[PDB]
Amino acid sequence: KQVSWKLVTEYAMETKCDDVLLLLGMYLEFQYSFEMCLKCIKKEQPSHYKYHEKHYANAAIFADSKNQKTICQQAVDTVLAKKRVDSLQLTREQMLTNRFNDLLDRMDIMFGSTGSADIEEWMAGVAWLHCLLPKMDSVVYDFLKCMVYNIPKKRYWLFKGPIDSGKTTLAAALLELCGGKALNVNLPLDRLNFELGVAIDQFLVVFEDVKGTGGESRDLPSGQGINNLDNLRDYLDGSVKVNLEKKHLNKRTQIFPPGIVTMNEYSVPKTLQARFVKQIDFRPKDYLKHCLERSEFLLEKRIIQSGIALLLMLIWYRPVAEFAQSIQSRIVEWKERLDKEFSLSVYQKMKFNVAMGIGVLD
Amino acid sequence: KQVSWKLVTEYAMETKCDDVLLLLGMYLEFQYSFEMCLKCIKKEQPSHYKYHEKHYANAAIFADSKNQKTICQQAVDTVLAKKRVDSLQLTREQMLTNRFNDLLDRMDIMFGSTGSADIEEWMAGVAWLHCLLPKMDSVVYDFLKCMVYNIPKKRYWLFKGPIDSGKTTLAAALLELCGGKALNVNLPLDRLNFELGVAIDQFLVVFEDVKGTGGESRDLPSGQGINNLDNLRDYLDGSVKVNLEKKHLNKRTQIFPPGIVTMNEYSVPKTLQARFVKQIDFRPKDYLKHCLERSEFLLEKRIIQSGIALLLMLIWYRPVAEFAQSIQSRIVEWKERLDKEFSLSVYQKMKFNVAMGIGVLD
Amino acid sequence: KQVSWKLVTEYAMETKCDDVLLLLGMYLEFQYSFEMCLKCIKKEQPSHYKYHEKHYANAAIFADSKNQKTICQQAVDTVLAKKRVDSLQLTREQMLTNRFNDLLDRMDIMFGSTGSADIEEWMAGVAWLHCLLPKMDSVVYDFLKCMVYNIPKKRYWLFKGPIDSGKTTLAAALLELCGGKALNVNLPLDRLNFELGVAIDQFLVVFEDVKGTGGESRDLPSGQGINNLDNLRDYLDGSVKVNLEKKHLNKRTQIFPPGIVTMNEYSVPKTLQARFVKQIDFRPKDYLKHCLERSEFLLEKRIIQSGIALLLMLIWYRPVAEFAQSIQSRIVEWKERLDKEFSLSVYQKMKFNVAMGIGVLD
Amino acid sequence: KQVSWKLVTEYAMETKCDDVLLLLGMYLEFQYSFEMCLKCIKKEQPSHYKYHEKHYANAAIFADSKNQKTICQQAVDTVLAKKRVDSLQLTREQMLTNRFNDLLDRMDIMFGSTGSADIEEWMAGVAWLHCLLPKMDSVVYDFLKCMVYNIPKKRYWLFKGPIDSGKTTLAAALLELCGGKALNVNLPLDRLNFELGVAIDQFLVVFEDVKGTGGESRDLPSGQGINNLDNLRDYLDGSVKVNLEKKHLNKRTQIFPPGIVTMNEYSVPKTLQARFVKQIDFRPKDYLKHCLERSEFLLEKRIIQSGIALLLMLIWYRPVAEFAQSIQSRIVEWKERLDKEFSLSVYQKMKFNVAMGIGVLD
Amino acid sequence: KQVSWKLVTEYAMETKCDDVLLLLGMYLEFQYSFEMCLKCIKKEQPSHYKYHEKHYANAAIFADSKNQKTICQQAVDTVLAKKRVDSLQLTREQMLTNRFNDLLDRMDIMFGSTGSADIEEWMAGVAWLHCLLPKMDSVVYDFLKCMVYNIPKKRYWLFKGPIDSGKTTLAAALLELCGGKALNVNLPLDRLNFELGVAIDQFLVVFEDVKGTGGESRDLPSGQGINNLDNLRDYLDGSVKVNLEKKHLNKRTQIFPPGIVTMNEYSVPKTLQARFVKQIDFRPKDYLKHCLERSEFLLEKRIIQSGIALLLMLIWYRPVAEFAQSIQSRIVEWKERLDKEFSLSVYQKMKFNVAMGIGVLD
Ligand SMILES: [Zn+2]
Ligand SMILES: [Zn+2]
Ligand SMILES: [Zn+2]
Ligand SMILES: [Zn+2]
Ligand SMILES: [Zn+2]
């Protein structure tokens, strides 16, 4: 008869769905009666069971509509349109909070009665991660203030370390905790703009394993990253705007995003060094290594490189007033859940274990 | 009057047809009275003789529509919308089971009333395959678990061996048993990424015949494939996601898929070797070659390279509960079939014939 | 019923919105009863809280339209149609005044009731800037007349100096004060034209840090930029029109725009030198650097690189009749504002503080 | 209600408007009542005030139309269609006359009561230009006959001279007087077709500053123009047609346009020299130089390089019967205006001045 | 009311108009009352004054249509649909006759009541041409039969000679007499195919000035054209079909067309020589050059390079039955015309004048 384009757009907006084919796929499942809906009955997908009923009617009509694709388009352009609006109107903190709400959205599910996640294992992760660096929760917190504040010449951290030293792991967790893209600058000085363009509208950036020509004896490859980074002093300290290339042209003109530079121990030009407001040296630690050997589940379930592991660390160490007013009530909610589940002594034993190199859950 | 776009879509989703021109051409065959259709009477194509009846009416109206291709476009987009949903909602074991179910549909027809396949020649294929490697049936089960469990740093197998040793054959059947694309890393470090993008949305990948440097004294061409793999540690052990490309622009981001590397015996760098959790050395065997010389059908009919020969082996060796609940009813059904046609001593003789290199069927 | 495409276009032309997705997303915010809109009550975004009322009705009908993007496309095309007319019908002084009027709208909000800007920190910016160069305020007026008069062979200024001398900062504020793109001539003689096309329809251009040959003994990278400029005598002094490119094909033909060349102290060919009607030598000064060291806000808040700091200086120094009639009413309005908040002795002390290198605000 | 697509097309055709965005922009201004139209009241734009009234009604409806863009398209295709018709049907003289009418169209405005042009200054231009070469008006006239006659092997003039010798100026004026494009052939023998394609449908062409390898001692660069010109003998003498490349393919097949070759004093191969029916040597003259020094307005208002300066010279020296019947009445109109404004003696003093090197208006 | 798309198509097919913008612009001229059309009264363009009457009505309705270009698109597509049919259904002799009929339509106007052509100057062209080669009129008939018979290994003629010997001229007229494109094989072995694709659907091809290696001692530039031709034995003698390209992808497959190779006297490989069934050596002659020196019109009006001069020669020399039946009525008609204006002794004197090198018309 007459399908509602606005009812579909609603579904898209509340699913943060920007995929046309995916939107279409999702919506066509609601055409069946939800009465004997197994997907709902078995609560296998939030993006499904939480909306099937309110959409049955519409979906059933959608199923007999001649331009399903076109309808989905507008619903998607609406989501992309909202994302274009937040880009130009939200403060970075508001940005960071939406990110947090999302990661939290997952946690409710992962750790929910339907999820498969073992919260004990994810708290074994906080403990391990908390042994990777001194005052790690204060370290994570600062990075955040740094990223949110995005202040000229004080927005880049340098993670310098060997290999299997932690930098890659922590940068990965931080990357996921804040949102953002990793970038490879060890490339042809001309096939560079290509990658730099990936930074467009990204909250923070991570230049992974930058390599330098200088240095070779100690077994480190060549690469031109360090060389290139030094030619991007304007993108790094962000005093003025910059033009980014994507789609094979000149799209956005913006302040280049703040972030991290993961490095393997080369010689860094003073002109480049001056670009980083903080530098962390990661040195391999035996107990941390053995510990993993005996705590396989940490690597096997990709827990220590999860920004979710880092969001749990903040909720577990940090005070509520440190979060954005808007989210606090949801954090408190979690603290209580977490404080009802683990005693400080249990957690402390976990760190003690990581310390003696024997797997957190012993 | 008014063509039912819905029905056409139903046929598309039932035939799993993702090709617009292929769908169009097939639906239009139904426009003729089935009350005489020889294609149906003679049961020529299941994709036809199982839907002609139900679709005559609507197909008859279809052939008189002024925009049949637009209709098929939506039927197809719907098929792709589903393949997109399952791409994110289904678990790997479910992905595997769907593959399985699809191979069984193929088997139902091959060995059915209106089919050509000679099941005796296909068990001969299993017999030959179960002589190629020790505990071969445990190897395939193991491989399947490795691929489904998809655990960081334990997702790749390395098949090494001269030409005509069997790694290519098993690697092919394995590919078809699981679904997935083969890739070629023997390209210029810049042509790589295009290829690596092929793995997008894939279950598993097979790096076909990687070439190394060193060994040209033993008559082996120097290539950069090995060298590239060592620069793909990220992709191989997949501890964190990665960005894949196509259409000359970035598409999906994900955990590179797990898989196999087929190699010809070049020396391997210890850093690369470490990415393989398992290595299988193939050596050409005389009796196996002699067996084929006296059993041409195994090659001419491409049986020992077929993933169906591997699904068949599983059904023949493996215990029903080792399969997913959902599919067991269909498996027990095939075991019975098989058991009712082949005794253990008969199958046992085939293996004996291969051992003596004379002709599985002698 | 029937969405009013006209109204949507009116909003677009009033918001000066040339982005389709940005327009769509914003108009759709109005679909909610303003009789409660917190975005309005809290006066979050002027682009919203000044039109929600007037557009509720129509936006409410808009959200129920089956082709919102097509509507926005026309709204946008209309905005571009105007930017195209003024491109040919407006005089340079009018072009400049429009720029000015736009910077004042930005200032009205920055220093308004619902804004963050700290005007005291912005006059401190002016104080620091009026110490960077002698008779700085006469320099900006001069520059503006040069740019508006746009006279052949008297349209370019050359800023020379080491790094951190101030040419980059002034050149940035100047750019933003006038509008226009920066270009990079440090490219292969064939990659040039693409870049040169960027200047199309622009008011002025800024050739950022051109590099020469000679001087590598003083630690300066050899580049071909200078060399290229000498091959662009036509563009620089613009006595006759030129053909500019984009989209990989020839577009507009015109007088290349006037502008600035920022350079690092390479020797200049007498033929090139002649194209510059004015040259400004920047030398890093100690007190100015010390001033910033004790006045972080000037950098962290990007004040001394802002074109607003220059418009602010003009308003503070220049006589009202030196502006275009049309804009004077708005200028006198700002002078009063300023005069009512800062006495000459206060502003005079700031300049004194910079001289002593201690903190404009001490 | 029902907008008139033909009324908009009229507007486009009488504005010679081929710009869609521009057409749209122009037309949308007529939607407002012309009663209090300031643009009209102030007569600021002919393309506006001369048509606002006859279009009010239509424009007001156009403003509420849903496909303004589409309407404008057809109106533009109509103008492009008319231009395609004149290409294949007008004699070159008719072509040259339309050009003249247009330049005249401007003159009425420049020198009208609304324009800003000083006719005395533009007559100072004729005088100066008339001192650049002997019998200059007869020279200009001939060139025209040459260009209009476009006769095999008698269609190319060679302007050979140093620098700041006049050739560039006169070629620029001639270029504008007749219509046409400038071309750079000092390029890669393969990136040549690119430029040559610009000549498509052009009335005449000008190869600016062709450079030759031969010659270097006298301080002249290298370049490959002379080299290339010699490989285009077929494009130059135009005995037979040629294929031009634009849009990155093979568009038009036509007789290559006639024109000028501006050169800097290299060695010209006899085979190339034979390509030019006339050759003019320009040698720097002191009085002409000083004169400009004292007659800045000539260069500052881009008067001496204007084809308009050259159209004024013909109207002032040449007899009416020398013009096309169609335009004569309009020229006579101008002669009278000019003869009413300046006495032969006043003009002669102007030349005398240029002769004594002291600025024409002394 | 309702524009007649059919009529517009009829005009297109009658005008043979395959250009959309050209059709649009022309049909729109008919929208004015023909009851006054000066273009008609003055008989300016046959494409106009022969259809204005019949199309006023419909063209008047056309100018008020909301999608004129869409209408013209179909008119054109229809013209191309016909050119496509005849491309496969017509015989070569018919292809040739159509060409002929088209050249006669051109001649009917050139030498008609409302035309400029001076037939006496065109017979002078024939006289000059019939002195360029012995039995010239038999040569053209021969060539035509060769081209129409299109027999494997007997389809190509080779014109050899210095510059200004006549091969270029005859080869040009021959091209225009038959229709077909010229191609340039003096390209890099990889750029070849693009060019070779030009010959698609063509009647004949002319390989313009092929260059060889050897002879640089006689002042002849080394090129790879000859070398390429030797690698095109397949194309040249066409015993079997070939694949031709365009739009950066494979199009038509066919017998490469027959044609001429114009060469400058480079040595030829015996394998290449064999592909030419006929060779014509041109040597510059003094009397012929002197004739032109005293008969400028032959060059200035491009007469001796015109295919019309060759059709004219045929009509003047050849017996009526040597033409196709269908066209004979029109040929006898031209013979009479000619016979009624030129006596044999008059034409004979022209040939005598050329022999003495004095001016065909003396
Ligand atoms: Zn459901
Ligand atoms: Zn059937
Ligand atoms: Zn609001
Ligand atoms: Zn007006
Ligand atoms: Zn007419």
Curated annotation (Swiss-Prot), chains A, B, C, D, E:
It is an enzyme of class 5 (isomerase). DNA helicase activity is inhibited by ATP-gamma-S. Keywords: Acetylation, Activator, ATP-binding, DNA replication, DNA-binding, Early protein, G1/S host cell cycle checkpoint dysregulation by virus, Glycoprotein, Helicase, Host nucleus, Host-virus interaction, Hydrolase, Inhibition of host innate immune response by virus, Inhibition of host interferon signaling pathway by virus, Inhibition of host JAK1 by virus, Interferon antiviral system evasion, Isomerase, Magnesium, Metal-binding, Modulation of host cell cycle by virus, Modulation of host E3 ubiquitin ligases by virus, Modulation of host ubiquitin pathway by virus, Nucleotide-binding, Oncogene, Phosphoprotein, Transcription, Transcription regulation, Viral immunoevasion, Zinc, Zinc-finger. One of its GO terms (cellular component) is host cell nucleus. It catalyses: Couples ATP hydrolysis with the unwinding of duplex DNA by translocating in the 3'-5' direction; ATP + H2O = ADP + phosphate + H(+). Zn(2+) binds at residues 37, 40, 48, 52. Residues 135-295 form the SF3 helicase domain. Residues 153-351 are annotated as: ATPase activity. GO terms for biological process: bidirectional double-stranded viral DNA replication; DNA replication; symbiont-mediated perturbation of host cell cycle G1/S transition checkpoint; symbiont-mediated perturbation of host ubiquitin-like protein modification; symbiont-mediated suppression of host innate immune response; symbiont-mediated suppression of host JAK-STAT cascade via inhibition of JAK1 activity; symbiont-mediated suppression of host type I interferon-mediated signaling pathway; viral DNA genome replication. DNA helicase activity requires Mg(2+). ATP binds at residues 161-168. A zinc finger (T-ag D1-type) spans 1-92. Phosphorylated on both serine and threonine residues. Small t antigen inhibits the dephosphorylation by the AC form of PP2A. O-Glycosylated near the C-terminal region. Its cofactor is Mg(2+). It is found in: Host nucleus. Signal peptide: none annotated. One of its GO terms (molecular function) is zinc ion binding. Its main location: host cell. Residues 72-362 are annotated as: Binding to host TP53 protein. Isoform large T antigen forms homohexamers in the presence of ATP. Interacts with host HDAC1. Interacts (via LXCXE domain) with host RB1; the interaction induces the aberrant dissociation of RB1-E2F1 complex thereby disrupting RB1's activity. Interacts (via LXCXE domain) with host pRB-related proteins RBL1 and RBL2. Interacts (via C-terminus) with host TOP1 and POLA1 allowing DNA replication. Interacts with host TP53, inhibiting TP53 binding to DNA. Interacts with host preinitiation complex components TBP, TFIIA and TFIID to regulate transcription initiation. The sequence shown is that of strain 776. The J domain is essential for multiple viral activities, including virion assembly, viral DNA replication, transformation and transcriptional activation. Isoform large T antigen is a key early protein essential for both driving viral replication and inducing cellular transformation. Plays a role in viral genome replication by driving entry of quiescent cells into the cell cycle and by autoregulating the synthesis of viral early mRNA. Displays highly oncogenic activities by corrupting the host cellular checkpoint mechanisms that guard cell division and the transcription, replication, and repair of DNA. Participates in the modulation of cellular gene expression preceeding viral DNA replication. Isoform 17kT antigen targets host RBL2 for degradation and promotes cell proliferation. Transactivates host cyclin A promoter through its J domain. This is Large T antigen. It comes from Simian virus 40.
